[PDB]
Amino acid sequence: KPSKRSPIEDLLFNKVTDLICAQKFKGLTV
């Protein structure tokens, strides 16, 4: 894999997840 992650770390990263731009245009950035 290009991420150098384990068979379980990949599952965990897949199992957890215009709005961003709309909020950014109101002055709130991340």
Added chain:
Amino acid sequence: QQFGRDIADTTDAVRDPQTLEILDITPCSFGGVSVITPGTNTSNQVAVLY
């Protein structure tokens, strides 16, 4: 319908009342500006992050 809105309920698109064309509206560039400096007891040069 004449103009559209996004999730945040602000004007996103408009309709030109001379050619029936729909134009998307986006705000022009803006952001924050930070200054990276060592101590003034060391140097006066700085760097800028946009």
